[PDB]
Amino acid sequence: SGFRKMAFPSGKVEGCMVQVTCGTTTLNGLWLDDVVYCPRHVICTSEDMLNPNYEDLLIRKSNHNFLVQAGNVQLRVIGHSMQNCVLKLKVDTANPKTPKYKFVRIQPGQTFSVLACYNGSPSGVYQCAMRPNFTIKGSFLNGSCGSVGFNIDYDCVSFCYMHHMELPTGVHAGTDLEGNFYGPFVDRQTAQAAGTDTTITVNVLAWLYAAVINGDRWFLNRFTTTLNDFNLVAMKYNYEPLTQDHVDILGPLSAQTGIAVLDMCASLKELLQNGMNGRTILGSALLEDEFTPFDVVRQCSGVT
Amino acid sequence: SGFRKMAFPSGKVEGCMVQVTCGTTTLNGLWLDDVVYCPRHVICTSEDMLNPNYEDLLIRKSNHNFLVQAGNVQLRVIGHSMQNCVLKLKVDTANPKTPKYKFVRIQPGQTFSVLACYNGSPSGVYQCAMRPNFTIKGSFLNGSCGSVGFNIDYDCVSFCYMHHMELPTGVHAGTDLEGNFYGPFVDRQTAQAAGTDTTITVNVLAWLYAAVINGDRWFLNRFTTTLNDFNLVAMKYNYEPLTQDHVDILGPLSAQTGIAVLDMCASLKELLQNGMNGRTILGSALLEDEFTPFDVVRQCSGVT
Ligand SMILES: O=C1N[C@]2(CCOc3ccc(Cl)cc32)C(=O)N1c1cncc2ccccc12
Ligand SMILES: O=C1N[C@]2(CCOc3ccc(Cl)cc32)C(=O)N1c1cncc2ccccc12
Numbered sequence: 001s002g003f004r005k006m007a008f009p010s011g012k013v014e015g016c017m018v019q020v021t022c023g024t025t026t027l028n029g030l031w032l033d034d035v036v037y038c039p040r041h042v043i044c045t046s047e048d049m050l051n052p053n054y055e056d057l058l059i060r061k062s063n064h065n066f067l068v069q070a071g072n073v074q075l076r077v078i079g080h081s082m083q084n085c086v087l088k089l090k091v092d093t094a095n096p097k098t099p100k101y102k103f104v105r106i107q108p109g110q111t112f113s114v115l116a117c118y119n120g121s122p123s124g125v126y127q128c129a130m131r132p133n134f135t136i137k138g139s140f141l142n143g144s145c146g147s148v149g150f151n152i153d154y155d156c157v158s159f160c161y162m163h164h165m166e167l168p169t170g171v172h173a174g175t176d177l178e179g180n181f182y183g184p185f186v187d188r189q190t191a192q193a194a195g196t197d198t199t200i201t202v203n204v205l206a207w208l209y210a211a212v213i214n215g216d217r218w219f220l221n222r223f224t225t226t227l228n229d230f231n232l233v234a235m236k237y238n239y240e241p242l243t244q245d246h247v248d249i250l251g252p253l254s255a256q257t258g259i260a261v262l263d264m265c266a267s268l269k270e271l272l273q274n275g276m277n278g279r280t281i282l283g284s285a286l287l288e289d290e291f292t293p294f295d296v297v298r299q300c301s302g303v304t
Numbered sequence: 305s306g307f308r309k310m311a312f313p314s315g316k317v318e319g320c321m322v323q324v325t326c327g328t329t330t331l332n333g334l335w336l337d338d339v340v341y342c343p344r345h346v347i348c349t350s351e352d353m354l355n356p357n358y359e360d361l362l363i364r365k366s367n368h369n370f371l372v373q374a375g376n377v378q379l380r381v382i383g384h385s386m387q388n389c390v391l392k393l394k395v396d397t398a399n400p401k402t403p404k405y406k407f408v409r410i411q412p413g414q415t416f417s418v419l420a421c422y423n424g425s426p427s428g429v430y431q432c433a434m435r436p437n438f439t440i441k442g443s444f445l446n447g448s449c450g451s452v453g454f455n456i457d458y459d460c461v462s463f464c465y466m467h468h469m470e471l472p473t474g475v476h477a478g479t480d481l482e483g484n485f486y487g488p489f490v491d492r493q494t495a496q497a498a499g500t501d502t503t504i505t506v507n508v509l510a511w512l513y514a515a516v517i518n519g520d521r522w523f524l525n526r527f528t529t530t531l532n533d534f535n536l537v538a539m540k541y542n543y544e545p546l547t548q549d550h551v552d553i554l555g556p557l558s559a560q561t562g563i564a565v566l567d568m569c570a571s572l573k574e575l576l577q578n579g580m581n582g583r584t585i586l587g588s589a590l591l592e593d594e595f596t597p598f599d600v601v602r603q604c605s606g607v608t
Contacts, residue, residue, distance in 0.1 A: 001443075001444070001445075001470055001474040002441060002442050002443040002444060002474060002475075002476065003443055004428075004430040004432070004441075004442065004443035005309060005430060006420070006428035006429065006430045006443060007311060007428060007429050007430065008428060008429070009314045009315075009318050009419060009426040009427070009428065009429055010313045010314050010315055010429065011313075011314055011315030011316075011318040011319070011426075012315075014313050014315040015315070115313060116310070116606075117608070118606045118608050119608065121608035122313040122315075122608065123313070123602075123606055123607060123608040124308075124310035124311060124312060124313065124603070125310065125311050125312070125313055125314065125429055126308040126309060126310045126311065128308070137306060137308075137587065138306050138308065139305075139306040139307055139308035139310060139603060140305070140306060141305075141604075141605075141606045143606065144606070166305055170305040170306060170518065170519060171306075172306065214474065215474060275582075276589075278579075280590065283441065284588075284589070284590070285580075285588070285589035285590040286584065286588070286589040298427075299428070299443060300445075301445075302420075302422045302427055302445045302447065302448070303427060304421070304422050304423065304425035304426065304427040
């Protein structure tokens with residue numbers, strides 16, 4: 001019992017964190033096999049960030065200008081290439097701690113763990129979600145770039161995010177491990193607005209199921225609704241539209257609690273329309289949307 | 305920018321997690337040097353838990369009845385002893401992954417990271433605090449016993465908690481690594497009520513400082529207060545009394561923001577008396593008390 005914003009164990013990802021320095025810029029890199037992945041803005045000065053031409057900036061860089069340090073030892077860079085917004089630095093040594101891994105591009109609403117790093121050293125681990133506007137509400141200071149987001153499936157690490165940027169609004173932007181930004185963000189110090197941060201409806205529902213499983217049942221009501229009626233209310237409250245796919249994905253939680261998905265939707269509808277009235281659900285005074293249905297099943301069943 | 309409930313990287317603690325089986329009971333153990341630490345209730349059956357006499361139950365156990373498994377390999381138990389509510393199993397092999405470590409007994413209000421484990425395998429990591437009633441609001445299923453709480457200071461892991469019990473109220477109870485329970489809890493399946501769960505005032509204040517640092521300033525007011533006046537209001541709201549030690553501990557956050565501690569106290573006082581009015585602070589609709597002043601300084605400065 002108890003429900004916590006839980007992150008995946010970070011050991012497997014800690015074994016991959018290295019420091020990459022180019023000129024005066026130092027950020028983090030991810031060392032998997034004989035390649036070190038890092039944000040391409042490592043080649044930029046703070047003046048370059050206003051309007052960088054990464055191809056031209058990269059021409060003035062050779063293998064020896066990229067200083068890669070793993071722990072306290074220097075890695076020899078035998079090649080370098082730019083793939084979208086990331087640099088791939090080929091080193092002569094394969095990482096002996098390379099876990100089984102995949103590079104995945106997640107969809108908005110999906111959650112992942114972030115290992116915040118500085119100078120190739122891990123400082124903390126937290127859980128977050130890819131917002132529907134393709135930003136992440138992270139915790140990153142200067143020097144955190146190159147910190148990664150990942151999920152673990154038993155022994156396979158699926159790397160889904162690499163930190164690149166903080167927007168003027170305090171939200172974060174980054175890429176998948178192929179260098180493609182999530183959302184319309186570009187690695188430039190220019191005016192970039194995030195877009196409407198809507199609530200991940202299916203995750204809120206999953207978290208309502210988690211509360212029922214853990215004993216918080218005050219919000220359960222005598223009502224039901226339809227997908228269309230619920231969506232009318234969801235639109236008004238800037239909630240993502242709920243589809244039949246979402247209902248299907250909530251099926252195992254619905255089965256475990258004996259509460260039909262549309263009944264939980266009517267409970268959520270009354271919570272949006274009437275508020276919490278000073279009450280809490282799983283020790284929270286707002287509706288939490290950063291647990292997917294898979295996270296709730298995982299946490300409530302103890303998958304290791 | 306951004307403020308997240310961040311846990312310490314868990315790699316160093318993952319390298320210590322083993323599975324301990326005695327009879328039909330399987331729980332987690334912590335392997336440091338040639339000793340495996342685990343809850344003594346590993347020797348109990350579910351019937352034994354009602355009224356166990358651990359000394360008598362232990363007499364019927366020999367070294368070979370404790371099955372210790374690290375990863376996929378079995379450790380040879382060459383000795384066993386009971387120290388308060390923990391068993392120490394001496395094994396013939398020192399853990400090659402033993403980090404630098406200490407065993408510490410924390411005070412209520414102090415925070416730590418938990419690596420929730422099942423069958424000696426880590427499943428997740430989260431941050432929590434030792435509540436003023438000596439319980440922890442964790443996330444633990446059956447089989448999680450022996451999961452540990454720790455803090456990391458650069459390379460030294462200070463182990464402060466070992467999970468033992470879940471109370472009928474869904475809160476958790478456990479010991480330090482010397483086997484002494486936090487609070488008045490005993491390792492028995494008997495009626496045990498936690499006590500008043502008060503709010504950790506100094507942590508709430510620290511988190512208000514974190515919000516100011518990260519831009520959430522709406523709650524800052526034109527008022528001030530005194531320690532005695534603030535404490536009158538704090539008592540009414542079941543908040544821990546604020547002492548001069550707490551004011552001193554908040555000094556570096558006070559210095560960074562230019563907001564005197566007593567001014568932040570008057571802001572908190574108005575928040576307790578008038579509520580949030582549908583507003584949020586650091587994306588939260590309630591006052592968060594599970595970040596110490598040290599955690600805020602650490603997160604906001606990037607200590608690795
Ligand atoms: O290190 C960098 N360089 C920046 C500086 C601004 O101009 C740009 C523009 C584009 C890109 Cl890709 C990065 C950058 C950036 O946001 N970050 C930071 C990342 N995350 C958090 C930060 C917290 C404080 C300070 C800087 C942080
Ligand atoms: O594994 C055990 N044995 C228990 C069973 C109850 O009687 C006692 C009495 C004292 C002690 Cl020390 C432990 C135990 C206990 O609480 N836990 C559990 C720990 N944490 C979470 C649990 C979630 C579900 C189920 C059991 C959980």
